[PDB]
């Protein structure tokens, strides 16, 4: 039927919800991550860090969740693990 995808929630923030993820396979795209993290909790917006010189993601990406409770699960599910052949670190950006 109709999902809704209301969105209209711009202005991302480091709010608890947000999940600090590093060592991510930049090779992917916002969409990819959005889903990859959707396995734990619903995602509203996908944020990614960028360097000044190199101008690359460097894995450092921030995932915005709907409910902090849901985020934690992910911050503990992927935290201290190996993905896409690269140890990924998760931590509540606060």
Q: What share of the chain is helix, strand, coil (3-state, %, to 5)?
A: 20, 25, 55
φ, ψ of residue 21 to 5 degrees: the values are -115, 130
CA distance 45 to 38: 11
| Contact between residue 63 and residue 18 where contact means Cβ atoms under 8 Å apart | yes
CA dihedral 17, 73, 61, 6 (to 10 degrees): -50
- Classify 12 as helix, strand or coil: coil
CA distance 80 to 82: 7
Classify residue 18 as exposed, middle or buried by CB count within 10 Å of its CB (0-12, 13-18, 19+): buried
CA distance 91 to 76: 8
**Residue 68, both tokens:** 């902090």
- Classify 21 as helix, strand or coil: strand
Q: Which domains does the chain have, with CATH numbers?
A: 15-94 (3.30.70.330)
């Amino acid at each position: 039927g109709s999902s809704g995808s209301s969105g209209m929630s711009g202005g991302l923030a480091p709010s608890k919800s947000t999940v600090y993820v590093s060592n991510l396979p930049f090779s992917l795209t916002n969409n990819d991550l959005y889903r990859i993290f959707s396995k734990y909790g619903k995602v509203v917006k996908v944020t990614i860090m960028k360097d000044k010189d190199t101008r690359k993601s460097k894995g450092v990406a921030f995932i915005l969740f709907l409910d902090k409770d849901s985020a934690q699960n992910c911050t503990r599910a992927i935290n201290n693990k190996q993905l896409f052949g690269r140890v990924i670190k998760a931590s509540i950006a606060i």
